[PDB]
């Protein structure tokens, strides 16, 4: 399954970074799980993840850094509290969980540029 996301995004003065991840739903979604991975030194790291039922607002946890909204084959990811030190490539993975068959999609990752204020 194909997943597309912006090639580059720079953070904000605060620490907020956003971007849209769009996947190619080959059928009746219903259950989709979205995961944001941070790649660096070729070492992946979960940034956050959430499952939403196609037809509901994508809602992350409280333990969570991210936040987002869904619109069709589109998701509105918003990471927060990013320090210039965690700047890097943020891959966006999408999974079609139910009903089966199961489909997996990995985007190329958006490059997020963050700078720690003076």
């Amino acid at each position: 399954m194909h997943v597309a996301q912006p090639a580059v995004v720079l953070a904000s003065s605060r620490g907020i970074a956003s971007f849209v991840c769009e996947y190619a739903s080959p059928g009746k979604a219903t259950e989709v799980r979205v995961t944001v991975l941070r790649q660096a030194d070729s070492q992946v790291t979960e940034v956050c993840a959430a499952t939403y039922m196609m037809g509901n607002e994508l809602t992350f946890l409280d333990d969570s850094i991210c936040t987002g909204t869904s619109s069709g084959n589109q998701v509105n990811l918003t990471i927060q509290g990013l320090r210039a030190m965690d700047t890097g490539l943020y891959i966006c993975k999408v999974e079609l969980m139910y009903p089966p068959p199961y489909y997996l999609g990995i985007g190329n990752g958006a490059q997020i540029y963050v700078i720690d204020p003076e």
Partner: protein, 199 residues
Amino acid sequence: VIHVTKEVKEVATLSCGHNVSVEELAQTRIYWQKEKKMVLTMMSGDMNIWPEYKNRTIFDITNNLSIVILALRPSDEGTYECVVLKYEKDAFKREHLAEVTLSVKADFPTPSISDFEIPTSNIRRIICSTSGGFPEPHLSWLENGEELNAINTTVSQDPETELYAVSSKLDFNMTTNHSFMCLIKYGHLRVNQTFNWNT
């Protein structure tokens, strides 16, 4: 990925390369899908085997969640996927992904050329045949690198096994010395057999 290669009439086991304790199965979703077609599933610990498999498949749960196909069909060849999702905290997460490829061999056994004596003077009739192979076979008779003309030939496919059976009749004169070769070509493969006659 792992590659399994069994012969059309054998049993084939495709391991999920992972397992789930019985205590966990209930809160697990296991999908065995070929290409993106469902082979079978277990959800809420309940089973569901798709038609094409409905009867020749055993879901060996305790043995690495692997499936066992008992009647290998050429179509069974392909890329199988074993997805295991476990509900955790807020919702189902993938606990394991496995990929296996199945290669089914179905070569035709060496053909058998048998002859019979008919009422005709010195006109002899030899029949060539071979079956239980795949894909579709193509027979041809050769004497001296010369494609002959047979009387009758028929090729059929078993509606259940998908396997093919071929057979053909050819007549010749018992006077002259003959050296025939019954060449069968199926796919990028070939297998024949030669029949010899002398005085």
